[model samples]
Target chain A: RMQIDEQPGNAIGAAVEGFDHATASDADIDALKSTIYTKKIAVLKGQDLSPQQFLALGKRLGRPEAYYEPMYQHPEVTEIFVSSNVPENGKQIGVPKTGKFWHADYQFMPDPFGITLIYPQVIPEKNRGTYFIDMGRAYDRLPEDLKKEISGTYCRHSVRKYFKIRPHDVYRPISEIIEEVERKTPAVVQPTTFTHPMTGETVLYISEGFTVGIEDQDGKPLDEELLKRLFDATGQLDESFEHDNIHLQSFEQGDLLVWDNRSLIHRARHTTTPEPTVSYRVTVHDERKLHDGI
Target chain B: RMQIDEQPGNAIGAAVEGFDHATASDADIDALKSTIYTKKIAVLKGQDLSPQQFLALGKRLGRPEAYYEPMYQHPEVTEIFVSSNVPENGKQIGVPKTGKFWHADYQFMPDPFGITLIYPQVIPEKNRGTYFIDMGRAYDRLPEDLKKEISGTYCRHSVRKYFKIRPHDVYRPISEIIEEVERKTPAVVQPTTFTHPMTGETVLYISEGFTVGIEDQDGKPLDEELLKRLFDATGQLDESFEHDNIHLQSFEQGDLLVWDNRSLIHRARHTTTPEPTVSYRVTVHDERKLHDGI
Candidate 1:
């Protein structure tokens, strides 16, 4: 039997305990997925599931796909992406600087990923935890003027903007860089105020990482002042972005955290010096296209 | 006459009222400086001081100097640095992105400036306020093991590292970048644990934007784990780095904030889009060299 309890001092996250992954019933998996959708983020403790079992667990909940970044993908099981700061054979074993800023997974894509599952293998001694903000709660607390201003607004999201400061390590010709990025991940327009398909709740969808500019109704660029106000309200430093709306998850070796990418924006707390911190991540896609059409 | 009142909700900030800039008594300035050194940050409301008067005020408190960046310096009075996102004559009137990350002003210099005074010219409607962290409180809250670990350590800080992402707009020779940076702003090694000269309080003197690496007793690089622990404790996301240790100062047009840079680290909140946010800033240097011997 699986027991789900709410994490202390937050409205978003729930902790799941006493679940056996090896002999879990089909009904148990359904309940887990239902709880995750309602809670936005679900934490499972004391798990010893293997790579295949982990992938199977994700499949039971949603469609698990391989991460786009080839460098971080596992060799045998392609669905898992490893994140670590440890170096091996003069090369980093996993992605070195992942989640240094606030963002949602695959937010630039036309069909963004839904649920993200992370299993920590090697946890650091220090509390290098991950933080999540409930976009729905953030939207509710935004100023009335800002809410009205961005009600009919849309924003342009591009992968190039995120990588402008920290470009990918791959070497390419200057001319090919733009073309390669366009071919792999082109710019997409998403609603500033997103309506969740399942819950029918409004969510502020703009992030500091991928959001480039806000567009008017005629597809023209809007005033910078409006965009800045919206960004500041949702910014990490804003008072509206308080600890009350945020949840911190300190990782353990066998802990697994599954979060809905549609409703929450997360960032990995920065490490002072590079240590062997590794986590296995799997992204799942949602069936319904929540952000289609204006 | 000047009346000082502690800002509600935090111990590090104070608000000053009933001070006349043109005809303030000598004892008033002395008491202001004394209170600022004790409180770490002092706020003044309803001030109408000109650029020259602002500089004069800083001089009364401490030896005020022109900021290092030439682009942001005022044309008439070089001591005042303007910070704004508003455009004037097809160019930004002042530096757009100041203190985007957490840092003390001029950590790269051997004798860094102490007192910093900022008078907001135009305040935004959406509360684009500045946030401050009490380093002394942060140090006291750190674990005993971390306190013992970083007691005798030193770290290297350089302006080059802070501006690595956003290089100056001025053009220089390709080979002269490093040379100019080293010549103008060389890296300085400062103790991880600093003792305040005036109040004799110990402060955690490291920030995320600077302090590139921790050094050992033999001038060798120390363990990454130790640095990671210290940085994580002082990080913005840490629970210890919560609102209990942070103070938010929302500005008005006639309000001025004077802070002790030696005892606190601050960051300007990130704005999403450009707005007409401007503040006049002055830097004050300490008389005694506190970090000279070590």
Candidate 2:
């Protein structure tokens, strides 16, 4: 059953009763799945599952694939941690230069749909939460003229230096990793207002990380101020948009969260307490690198 | 009196021991200084100094300078730490993209000579030792023609990308740091056989890390194999050039070892044991930026 309310200020909260995530009945699972698809955000609190069961749940939700070679050890898992002391190592990706950036999941590729699922195994002494910014709402609030201007742009992504610079015996360098990033995401310029491949709604395409300078109608670099203003405008909208739709859900003993990577930008915040020993599986739109060909 | 041996090796080892690094009178210190001026390499084992004293000793040995703003925290000391763990606080240089690579220190400088002192504090349990290749002998072993070819060529150096890519902040991306590296190092190329402005002897100018590309006599990119072969030949000499060198020195507490950065190529090996803790002091060459002027 679904409830709807039309009030200037509204809040919705629910707690499912008499259901076990580990051995939920078909009807219960369907209900859970339906709730997830219907809401922009879904929170599953106090559910527990073994590592294998978590992987099974991920596989059931979507197909899992490996995009970056030799770097990603687990296939169905996009990002995870084993302990607060040591996390699974990967080729270090370069940080972006921009301030406060946002983008959709795999927006750099043609086929970019995946579920970004994180399981914080150890919460440190301090507590922290991963913040999410909804791009759809951010896009909806943008001025009409500005939205039209960004609709015609593309971004370039590469991993050339990533694999090359790593310590030889420990890991391969950036070129090899970039080769994989490109193989999966082949560099292409798509609309700034990208039509969600699954939902068919136009969402904001710009992301702060790795979304370098943009090109204009003639494929020339856009004026610096123009790009800056667009980025700033989108960033401003993120605050309220996040305040309204974002949820800082807590992790339980065996909680698995699968979110739509394409429509959201997420980052973990510093926690007050040590992280926990949690692990989860991942589902991807295609068998591409962590980032589809950029 | 030094004993004469029929074998080819010199009695330099005995000569080295005769000079007391500790408790040497002025006359004795003067005599030892003369020997050091004539000999390119020597040892000072079992010498103990406080962390503060080490910085003073470095200043006495060479002209000391501060690192580019906001590097290793302590103003008196500048050092590089190569490890897998993310630094929890300041006082550590961000591991650059090439931080994991093998390389020498300040090879692209016009007059590159300084002390590279390292004391391993926490080594990984794997017992991986940092590899050291002596370029002094590596240069001596080069075939006549190869040496002649390298003499005219130049390799560029800079802290530009090498240290910037491994920034501490996940949000502070690589591009921003690289831009800072460019500002500090400013694109400049140095001769392959850099003749020391004072000593006038040619030192090999082959830094393993951040040696982007070598230029031909006409300033075009040189052949990769040619450069690699030259590097391989020079690196191989480390085996023959014998000394009190540590191929894989298991670090002990209160250990302080120094090397000639100009002639040494060092690489950290993968370690998996009682983890070691390391604190160090580095003295860089006294000179202006690689590109002092336009």
Candidate 3:
């Protein structure tokens, strides 16, 4: 018997006890998606599964996406991307510092990922966890005056600032590095506030991590001062709203964390980890109409 | 003898009791300048003085400048600019809604005003207070990490966003209005973190009301994302730092409010006042090296 224990207050996530993802049926998988949509995240602990099994479950919930970068692809399953610093040899075993900043999955793309699966492969000794801010609660908590002011506005999102530079790229000109990244992952526009397709919940959909700036009602990049105000109001700038809703999901052995990308803003935190951490991640399209933007 | 009553913590103001500007000696005026310089604002209440007498004291403290616009020039003293919604003979009396937005005096000019004096001639009923944010304190309260990231950065300030649109200009293209404003009060560059010349205090010097964006160390207009972060850190975006340092000065009849333009950011508020509000303002060059901006 599986029971969903709901999280309290403005925190995003529910712990699902007595569940086995490997043996999950079609109805169970559908229920998991519902829980993720409404609760923002679903925590399933003490599960051991291969990359194939995890990819299969992700496919059952939605279409699993192959990461645009070949280096990020998991060796076992191409759809299951690897985000780890643990190395097999002298080279990086996975894409290092993935999601280190606040962003939803695949936001700087034409079609953003809706659901994300993160299975911690190796747990670190110190401060190793994923941090999430509930955007739904953030939208609800916005001052009435500011909500009206930013209503129906759009934000331009880019992966430019998030590009992780390496020591090898020291000789390369910054313009050249930026040019390569631009061709790979160009900027995209999304609503400042968007409505979730499955849950019909309105959410503030911007992050200090990926959002470049805001656009006018006429779909033009508008005032810097105005955009800065909107971003600050979202609590992305100064973390003014953090005490109310920022939640951490500390990783334990054999823990699988799945989250709805539309409902929460996430940042990866493992900088202080004593040992290398590894997490197998899979981004999926839930096959639902997303972003009810103006 | 004038009794100096210093304001509470973080608030940048002092009230000078028993001060008579008309009968003040050179030492008295010089002492008054010191109060304004340290406290950011010095308030002298229950004063009866003409524009000429006020201009004389202003001249003693610093070189009072004439308003660039004829509309803002005082009838009695050209150096004493008029900021009033009060009409005289059905014609506009002063620069309508002057300092309506947050800004330091003459920020768009090359030689910004170092000292400013406002003598209120008329007080309104509802919500007619002048707001001031202490930039020196704001600079001190900034996170140590952010302070280092923004060190030696410059900000681009503009007055175009603050241009009040009249009903007559509704039909004209916005480009035309922008062009006129640009030529008159074009954008200027100032250090994001500046040290006051007289007090030698570091001050954060950007306002949501006038600052456009930030420039890089190379003196180039830089990234919007980075600039937005700097503006947010200044508390100009969401007023995150407002509660700590935003001090309001509600006017009474015969109240003289003098402030050092180098250490404070001010906004004029009178949207809900039942009657007209008039203030005789004189902006002056204090003959000090005003900015040690990096």
Give stretches of model 2 more than 4 Å off: A1-38, A44-46, A65-111, A116-130, A157-191, A210-213, A216-228, A236-258, A269-281, A284-294, B2-294
DockQ leaderboard ranking: 2, 1, 3
* RMSD per model, one decimal: 24.2, 10.2, 23.9
User: Runs in model 1 with CA error above 4 Å?
Assistant: A1-294, B7-10, B164-179, B237-243, B290-294
Q: Candidate 2: RMSD over Cα atoms?
A: 10.2
Candidate 2's C-alpha lDDT? 0.47
Which digits, one per residue and each the tens of the lDDT, describe model 2 over residues B85-196?
3344544332322234556655434344454555444445455545665455557667899888776786666544345333242333334444555675665676666543
Candidate 1 chain B worst ten-residue window by lDDT:
B165-174
True interface contacts retained by model 3? 0.00
What is the C-alpha local distance difference test score of candidate 1?
0.74
lDDT to native, each model: 0.74, 0.47, 0.76
lDDT per residue, candidate 1, B171-232, as tens digits? 21112444566787778888877888878889888776677778876678897667677767
Docking class of 3: incorrect
The candidate, 1 or 2, that scores higher on TM-score is 2
Q: Please provide, for model 1 over A68-165, each residue's C-alpha lDDT reduced to its tens digit, 9 standing for 90 to 100.
A: 76766766688988776666667655466576667788888887877899888878788588888778878999989888878788888877644431
Query: Which candidate achieves the best TM-score against the true structure?
Result: 2
Q: Is the docking of candidate 1 incorrect, acceptable, medium or high quality?
A: incorrect
